Design an enzyme around this catalytic site. Structure first.
Site, mmCIF file in Angstrom:
data_model
loop_
_atom_site.group_PDB
_atom_site.id
_atom_site.type_symbol
_atom_site.label_atom_id
_atom_site.label_comp_id
_atom_site.label_asym_id
_atom_site.label_seq_id
_atom_site.Cartn_x
_atom_site.Cartn_y
_atom_site.Cartn_z
ATOM 1 N N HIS A 48 0.831 -1.206 0.000
ATOM 2 C CA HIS A 48 0.000 0.000 0.000
ATOM 3 C C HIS A 48 0.872 1.265 0.000
ATOM 4 C CE1 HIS A 48 -3.285 -2.825 0.038
ATOM 5 N NE2 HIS A 48 -2.779 -3.393 1.108
ATOM 6 N N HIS A 74 6.242 6.955 5.998
ATOM 7 C CA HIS A 74 5.836 6.354 4.748
ATOM 8 C C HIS A 74 5.477 7.469 3.781
ATOM 9 C CE1 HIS A 74 2.129 6.910 7.089
ATOM 10 N NE2 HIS A 74 1.616 7.184 5.894
ATOM 11 N N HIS A 76 3.187 8.851 0.138
ATOM 12 C CA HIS A 76 2.060 8.752 -0.768
ATOM 13 C C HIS A 76 2.446 9.485 -2.060
ATOM 14 C CE1 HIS A 76 -0.737 7.556 2.612
ATOM 15 N NE2 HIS A 76 0.061 8.369 3.287
ATOM 16 N N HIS A 99 4.699 11.207 5.428
ATOM 17 C CA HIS A 99 4.026 11.197 6.724
ATOM 18 C C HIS A 99 4.947 10.547 7.755
ATOM 19 C CE1 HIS A 99 -0.234 11.382 4.827
ATOM 20 N NE2 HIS A 99 0.422 12.549 4.794
ATOM 21 N N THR A 180 -5.667 7.545 7.785
ATOM 22 C CA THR A 180 -6.208 7.557 6.430
ATOM 23 C C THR A 180 -6.243 6.136 5.889
ATOM 24 O OG1 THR A 180 -4.119 7.868 5.412
ATOM 25 C CG2 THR A 180 -5.292 9.889 6.049
ATOM 26 N N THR A 181 -6.060 5.167 6.775
ATOM 27 C CA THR A 181 -6.094 3.773 6.412
ATOM 28 C C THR A 181 -6.897 3.106 7.514
ATOM 29 O OG1 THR A 181 -4.901 1.924 5.670
ATOM 30 C CG2 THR A 181 -3.943 2.916 7.559
HETATM 31 C C1 LIG Z 1 -0.054 0.537 7.255
HETATM 32 S S1 LIG Z 1 0.820 1.876 6.730
HETATM 33 O O1 LIG Z 1 2.144 1.977 7.304
HETATM 34 O O2 LIG Z 1 1.164 1.814 5.327
HETATM 35 C C2 LIG Z 1 0.133 3.301 7.054
HETATM 36 C C3 LIG Z 1 -0.459 4.069 5.894
HETATM 37 N N1 LIG Z 1 -0.517 3.435 4.662
HETATM 38 C C4 LIG Z 1 -1.488 3.701 3.587
HETATM 39 C C5 LIG Z 1 -0.836 4.070 2.258
HETATM 40 C C6 LIG Z 1 -1.861 4.548 1.224
HETATM 41 C C7 LIG Z 1 -3.226 3.857 1.236
HETATM 42 O O3 LIG Z 1 -3.544 3.586 -0.136
HETATM 43 C C8 LIG Z 1 -3.338 2.574 2.097
HETATM 44 C C9 LIG Z 1 -2.372 2.461 3.311
HETATM 45 C C10 LIG Z 1 -1.050 5.424 6.186
HETATM 46 F F1 LIG Z 1 -1.584 6.178 5.233
HETATM 47 C C11 LIG Z 1 -1.045 6.015 7.548
HETATM 48 S S2 LIG Z 1 -1.586 7.504 7.832
HETATM 49 N N2 LIG Z 1 -1.684 8.332 6.373
HETATM 50 O O4 LIG Z 1 -2.846 7.567 8.509
HETATM 51 O O5 LIG Z 1 -0.518 8.300 8.420
HETATM 52 C C12 LIG Z 1 -0.411 5.270 8.645
HETATM 53 F F2 LIG Z 1 -0.437 5.846 9.851
HETATM 54 C C13 LIG Z 1 0.199 3.940 8.428
HETATM 55 N N3 LIG Z 1 0.572 3.270 9.553
HETATM 56 C C14 LIG Z 1 -0.220 3.443 10.812
HETATM 57 C C15 LIG Z 1 0.590 3.969 12.007
HETATM 58 C C16 LIG Z 1 1.264 2.842 12.760
HETATM 59 C C17 LIG Z 1 0.124 2.160 13.503
HETATM 60 O O6 LIG Z 1 0.571 0.869 13.900
HETATM 61 C C18 LIG Z 1 -1.172 2.011 12.685
HETATM 62 C C19 LIG Z 1 -0.934 2.132 11.175
HETATM 63 ZN ZN ZN Z 2 -0.002 8.419 5.360
#
Ligand code: A1JC2
Ligand code: ZN
Ligand code: A1JC2
Ligand code: ZN
EC number: 4.2.1.1
Lengths: 239, 239
Positions: A48, A74, A76, A99, A180-181
């Site tokens: 993702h 991570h 986007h 982020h 956002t996930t």
């Molecule tokens: C699971 S993750 O690390 O990729 C993640 C994302 N990933 C998204 C990328 C774009 C989408 O198409 C799907 C997934 C994310 F966007 C936020 S966000 N934008 O809300 O910051 C995250 F916080 C984390 N990880 C979180 C934080 C760590 C905790 O254990 C829960 C998951």
């Molecule tokens: Zn994010």
């Protein structure tokens, strides 16, 4: 996840004219972000996004008595000639967004912080095209080929994590929103820098063109649609 | 507790010229505060203050999605010719202060909320001397002699708790601090009304002169000293 249907979700369109100037918003303070090369960190294609797990000891404060520890970062991103930031400004979508996700020091684990006010804090910056290769970014981007496959990971040397962020920590928007996930839990303090970070065109192409996601599909355009403010007021650290 | 020596304690001196105006601070929302005559409420002299237990259903918001439930209210007061508010304004101590203590809806228990940011919120109003008798406060003051003894308690008719508070819910100061008694836990959001409430000189005397504490001591001057901001900036909901 029912929280993905909450009234106060992220990301949002930032309209600086409707933002509220609040002079209580002081410059962000980061401690321990300048890492030694060892131990290495884990860089993972989770299908993702690309995520870098951060070690203990990265401390971030939103202000006096508002203390956090960094967990991970991570990215986007979009696709050839298509922007993929999550946040927008006046409807403008930037090429990419970083982020850096943090946990309040009042909580030992993420699961206790989820949905609690100010339990999680995210630092967000837009990535734009500049003329020069960004050397901090190059350390991550040069390893994406190693993790092209969904669910793959590699180890990378520690680096100055603060060099993935803008140098101006004084000028930012702040609002309360959500992950956002799934599970899109609320109570997340979002900080979005005014200054952007510059990557080369080649760097932005590496980011959007290298990684694969679920089932023989390129991992691209990995951003959630803009969510309504629904009466929340975005604050700004500058008039 | 050593938490009483923490850096971000309450109460504080409010200096309105140094408060930061944030237009994001919306009018407080207090629903369910108009209680019927039954059920009755426990009023209690704990030796340190007089405390009214509140029932379920008193809902309070500090902003969008930042909701609270009231638990209890209690008072701080002086002696004869001696003011006993906890907060001061440019060094002025008011005759007395009311505190309405609330629990975030994101926490099921007080003990989980202690020490967590925004876990508890207190609404605070200054009580001053005016010419009229205050009907709202009479309901409580007229009952004090029945509980003059440390540890005694009585049942009182339900009352409109909101009637004990000042007129304009759009005008307040706000900061993050602590409980003003051990365990002095941090992370408490204090909201201090800009306007005051008025009681008669007789009522003020009833408040300060009726209750007995530990030993054979009068229950008086039940306020903590002013603590330093240590870099915290007090916010204001008005220019
Ligand atoms: C699971 S993750 O690390 O990729 C993640 C994302 N990933 C998204 C990328 C774009 C989408 O198409 C799907 C997934 C994310 F966007 C936020 S966000 N934008 O809300 O910051 C995250 F916080 C984390 N990880 C979180 C934080 C760590 C905790 O254990 C829960 C998951
Ligand atoms: Zn994010
Ligand atoms: C002893 S008390 O309950 O009357 C009290 C409370 N109650 C809280 C106790 C701790 C939490 O577990 C639940 C809520 C409080 F919130 C504050 S305050 N100001 O922090 O809101 C008090 F000051 C006092 N009582 C004090 C005791 C010492 C005396 O001199 C002043 C009154
Ligand atoms: Zn109190």
């Amino acid at each position: 996840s029912p929280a993905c249907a909450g009234r106060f979700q992220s990301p949002v369109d930032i309209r600086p004219q409707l933002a509220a100037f609040s002079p209580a918003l002081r410059p962000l303070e980061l401690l321990g972000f300048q890492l030694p090369p060892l131990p290495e960190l884990r860089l993972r294609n989770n299908g993702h996004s690309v995520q870098l797990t951060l070690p203990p000891g990265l401390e971030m404060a939103l202000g006096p008595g508002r203390e956090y520890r960094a967990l991970q970062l991570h990215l986007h991103w979009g696709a050839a000639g298509r922007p993929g930031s999550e946040h927008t400004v006046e409807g403008h979508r930037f090429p990419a967004e970083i982020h850096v996700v943090h946990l309040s020091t009042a909580f030992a684990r993420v699961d206790e912080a989820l949905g609690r006010p100010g339990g999680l804090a995210v630092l967000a910056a837009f990535l734009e095209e500049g003329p020069e290769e960004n050397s901090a970014y190059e350390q991550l981007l040069s390893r994406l080929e190693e993790i092209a496959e969904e669910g793959s990971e590699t180890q990378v040397p520690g680096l100055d994590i603060s060099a993935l962020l803008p140098s101006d920590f004084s000028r930012y928007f702040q609002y309360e929103g959500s992950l956002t996930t799934p599970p899109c839990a609320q109570g997340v303090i979002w900080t979005v820098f005014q200054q952007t970070v510059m990557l080369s065109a080649k760097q932005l192409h590496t980011l959007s063109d290298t990684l694969w996601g679920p089932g023989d599909s390129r991992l691209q355009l990995n951003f959630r649609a803009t969510q309504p403010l629904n009466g929340r007021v975005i604050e700004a650290s500058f008039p």
